[PDB]
Amino acid sequence: KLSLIKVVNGCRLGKIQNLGDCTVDIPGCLLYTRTGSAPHLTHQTLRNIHGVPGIAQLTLSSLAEHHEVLAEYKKGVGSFIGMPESLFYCSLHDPVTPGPAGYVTSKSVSVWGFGGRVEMTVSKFMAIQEALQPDWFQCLSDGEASIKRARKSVDRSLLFLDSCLRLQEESEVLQKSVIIGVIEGGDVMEERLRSARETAKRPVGGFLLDGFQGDVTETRLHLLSSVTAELPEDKPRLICGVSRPDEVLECIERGVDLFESFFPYQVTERGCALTFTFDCQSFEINLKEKKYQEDFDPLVRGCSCYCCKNHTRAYIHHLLMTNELLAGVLLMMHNFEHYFGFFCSIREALKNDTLAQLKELICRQM
Amino acid sequence: ESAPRIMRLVAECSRSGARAGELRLPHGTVATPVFMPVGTQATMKGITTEQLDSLGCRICLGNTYHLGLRPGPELIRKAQGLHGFMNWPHNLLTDSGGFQMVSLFSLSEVTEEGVHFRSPYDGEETLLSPERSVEIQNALGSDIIMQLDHVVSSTVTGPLVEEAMHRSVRWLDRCIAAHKHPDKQNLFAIIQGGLNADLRTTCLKEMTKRDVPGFAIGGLSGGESKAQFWKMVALSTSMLPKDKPRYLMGVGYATDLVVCVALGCDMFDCVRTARFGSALVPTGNLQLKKKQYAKDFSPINPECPCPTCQTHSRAFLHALLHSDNTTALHHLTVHNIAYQLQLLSAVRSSILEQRFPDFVRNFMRTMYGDHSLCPAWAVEALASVGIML
Numbered sequence: 001k002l003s004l005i006k007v008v009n010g011c012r013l014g015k016i017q018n019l020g021d022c023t024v025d026i027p028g029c030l031l032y033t034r035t036g037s038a039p040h041l042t043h044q045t046l047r048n049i050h051g052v053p054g055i056a057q058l059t060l061s062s063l064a065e066h067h068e069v070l071a072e073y074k075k076g077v078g079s080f081i082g083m084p085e086s087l088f089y090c091s092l093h094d095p096v097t098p099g100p101a102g103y104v105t106s107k108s109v110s111v112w113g114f115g116g117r118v119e120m121t122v123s124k125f126m127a128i129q130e131a132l133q134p135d136w137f138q139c140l141s142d143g144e145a146s147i148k149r150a151r152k153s154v155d156r157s158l159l160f161l162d163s164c165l166r167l168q169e170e171s172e173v174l175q176k177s178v179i180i181g182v183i184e185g186g187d188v189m190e191e192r193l194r195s196a197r198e199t200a201k202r203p204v205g206g207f208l209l210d211g212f213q214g215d216v217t218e219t220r221l222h223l224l225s226s227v228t229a230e231l232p233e234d235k236p237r238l239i240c241g242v243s244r245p246d247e248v249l250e251c252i253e254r255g256v257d258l259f260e261s262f263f264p265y266q267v268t269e270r271g272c273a274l275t276f277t278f279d280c281q282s283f284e285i286n287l288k289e290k291k292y293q294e295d296f297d298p299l300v301r302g303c304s305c306y307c308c309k310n311h312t313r314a315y316i317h318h319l320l321m322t323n324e325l326l327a328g329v330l331l332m333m334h335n336f337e338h339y340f341g342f343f344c345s346i347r348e349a350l351k352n353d354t355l356a357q358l359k360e361l362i363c364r365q366m
Numbered sequence: 367e368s369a370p371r372i373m374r375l376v377a378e379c380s381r382s383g384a385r386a387g388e389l390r391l392p393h394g395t396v397a398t399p400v401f402m403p404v405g406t407q408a409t410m411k412g413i414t415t416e417q418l419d420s421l422g423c424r425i426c427l428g429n430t431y432h433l434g435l436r437p438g439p440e441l442i443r444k445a446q447g448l449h450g451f452m453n454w455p456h457n458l459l460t461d462s463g464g465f466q467m468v469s470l471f472s473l474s475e476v477t478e479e480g481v482h483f484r485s486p487y488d489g490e491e492t493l494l495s496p497e498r499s500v501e502i503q504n505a506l507g508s509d510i511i512m513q514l515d516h517v518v519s520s521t522v523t524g525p526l527v528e529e530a531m532h533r534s535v536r537w538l539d540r541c542i543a544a545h546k547h548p549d550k551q552n553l554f555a556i557i558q559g560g561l562n563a564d565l566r567t568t569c570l571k572e573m574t575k576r577d578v579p580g581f582a583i584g585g586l587s588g589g590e591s592k593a594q595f596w597k598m599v600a601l602s603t604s605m606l607p608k609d610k611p612r613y614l615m616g617v618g619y620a621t622d623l624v625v626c627v628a629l630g631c632d633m634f635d636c637v638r639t640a641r642f643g644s645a646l647v648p649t650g651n652l653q654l655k656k657k658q659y660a661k662d663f664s665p666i667n668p669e670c671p672c673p674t675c676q677t678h679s680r681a682f683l684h685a686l687l688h689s690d691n692t693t694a695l696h697h698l699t700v701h702n703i704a705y706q707l708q709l710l711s712a713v714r715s716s717i718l719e720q721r722f723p724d725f726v727r728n729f730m731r732t733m734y735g736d737h738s739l740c741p742a743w744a745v746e747a748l749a750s751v752g753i754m755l
């Protein structure tokens with residue numbers, strides 16, 4: 001149940017209900033995870049971060065190769081990885097490490113985890129989801145269309161969508177799981193509208209806007225707003241591969257609700273800390289730089305995360321130079337806290353009608 | 367007119383040498399016997415100050431040689447000492463900087479002036495005198511500092527053993543004279559003398575004439591036989607003052623710990639099994655990379671209160687060891703430190719409750735089985751202090 005509050009300049013402010021029956025604020029982001037954990041964080045350290053999303057993103061690519069053990073476990077992936085109190089959306093691909101392209105046919109899609117290619121027909125896909133038991137999952141889809149190749153991306157995804165719906169209708173396990181429809185069609189306007197209008201015909205719980213990643217062209221942004229125009233209002237709109245703050249804001253203006261949070265993880269992995277301001281009148285610093293060796297300030301003055309309240313730039317610099325994993329822990333805590341705080345500021349700006357100002361504040365720092 | 371004692375004894379076993387005490391240190395009182403993890407081992411594996419505190423750690427080690435390289439003593443000075451640099455509020459113990467974690471390829475021969483470091487590719491050498499070792503540890507600001515000693519392997523023989531032992535006495539005196547603020551840091555002597563009972567006896571007799579707040583037992587755990595190991599430990603505790611702490615360096619195996627507590631030791635350190643996938647348990651260890659754990663959905667130890675055992679299954683740890691090894695190594699290191707701290711907490715509770723002999727018998731029974739299956743040296747060491755199995 002998606003209940004809106006306002007649509008200020010095409011931006012959807014609201015909350016999703018009946019999830020138990022937990023809730024998720026929109027616009028918002030999903031907690032990014034790799035192979036069943038928020039990277040470098042635990043239950044304890046995650047509890048201190050403020051504004052943690054209600055729902056966490058898992059990827060088939062990192063879990064598919066663990067099918068056997070999970071089916072034996074029976075109680076689903078959330079319980080298996082030790083955080084059963086959380087909601088999980090299971091997408092097909094990891095946004096950071098998607099794997100080699102060109103293995104999609106009208107009959108199977110392949111993902112790569114730590115080991116070897118896991119090729120999945122519809123049956124195998126649904127059999128894996130029966131073991132994972134996520135609350136939401138992306139339906140199997142062809143997102144590799146990037147003219148005649150775009151027509152196929154729609155039809156394969158339509159074919160996968162209806163087969164998965166059939167199998168879900170007769171699977172007791174997947175009854176309480178919500179399928180997300182996937183809009184394809186690549187960069188061909190005609191197919192995007194077709195995928196949009198045809199996927200909406202089916203009773204999916206939400207929509208995934210696939211193939212809009214950057215390298216984000218204003219051409220793609222036009223397709224995006226044209227696609228969201230064909231989509232109903234009462235259903236959530238997710239997007240994949242869009243996480244940088246300026247891109248997030250462009251997509252929110254065009255009706256997109258939910259975002260992946262892989263951006264703060266990427267910042268962490270290169271030894272960097274988010275510093276961009278998101279409240280009042282450079283977006284990151286590289287803690288490996290020698291200028292931080294004697295800098296005893298926190299990463300961000302006034303930040304409330306455990307890293308900033310209790311550790312210095314100097315210390316984190318040292319930890320990176322000696323490759324201690326505590327560096328990645330403290331950077332992940334700060335970067336997630338900063339990024340979730342950024343989304344809190346978006347929802348507050350929408351409430352107060354100041355999103356245009358926040359966009360200029362973000363875009364002058366990126 | 368001796369110096370004030372930093373330890374008080376709260377209970378003693380009537381048969382054995384087991385002691386339960388408290389160390390009144392500038393960053394808090396520490397219950398003994400105590401296992402002291404290396405702080406950088408935990409942080410290298412992503413363990414925070416909060417997590418290490420949460421496990422019950424109240425004193426941990428800093429490695430002076432490594433800290434002297436990165437970030438260096440001057441920077442730790444500007445950072446307000448090691449406590450401020452790493453944001454650690456409890457106690458710290460640092461070594462002299464001349465031996466621990468120093469590669470033999472990096473050392474030239476010891477002289478009376480001190481230890482000599484070599485720099486790569488025929489570069490110039492660096493001296494570490496006893497006076498400079500104390501000054502470095504003054505800058506680190508740790509609560510316990512160790513004398514600079516002349517360390518030789520426990521399996522070296524010949525005149526070098528006696529030579530190094532006597533130089534260690536002389537360097538002790540120089541460290542005492544250099545340490546101008548015993549009201550702020552506690553300097554410990556280190557007994558040497560190898561496996562030579564006469565040399566170690568001499569080192570014990572002479573070093574205890576120096577009024578330092580505590581005594582460590584060095585030179586052991588370097589490949590000697592177990593027969594010789596425990597007899598040297600017992601020789602040492604028989605001559606170290608009862609009213610000061612006994613710190614046994616480089617002993618961390620659970621069975622060794624329990625036996626050495628029974629011989630009268632108070633503090634322990636040891637360096638790492640988590641990298642092989644091993645989880646410490648009361649029957650020894652679990653090798654979680656083995657296929658038999660792939661579908662084992664129970665925790666490492668249902669009675670372990672560590673965050674790994676209250677959150678995760680063997681099956682999940684087994685999957686991560688393969689798929690996300692860095693993450694698994696965090697979880698295993700947290701549990702392995704927890705196990706060591708819980709072992710010593712349980713040891714301490716048994717001495718306060720006057721049931722240490724029964725605790726040892728339960729420990730050995732769980733760890734080995736019948737008396738015949740227990741290590742022969744441990745049976746003999748324990749029998750020498752009235753604990754029969």
Ligand SMILES: Nc1nc2[nH]cc(CN[C@H]3C=C[C@H](O)[C@@H]3O)c2c(=O)[nH]1
Nearest residue numbers: 465519520584585586587588615616
């Ligand atoms: N300074 C100092 N640090 C120390 N750490 C551990 C020990 C005791 N065990 C080491 C010494 C000799 C053995 O071969 C073993 O390698 C020690 C010491 O005797 N002196």
Ligand SMILES: [Zn+2]
Nearest residue numbers: 303305308334
């Ligand atoms: Zn912060």
Ligand SMILES: [Zn+2]
Nearest residue numbers: 670672675701
């Ligand atoms: Zn545990």
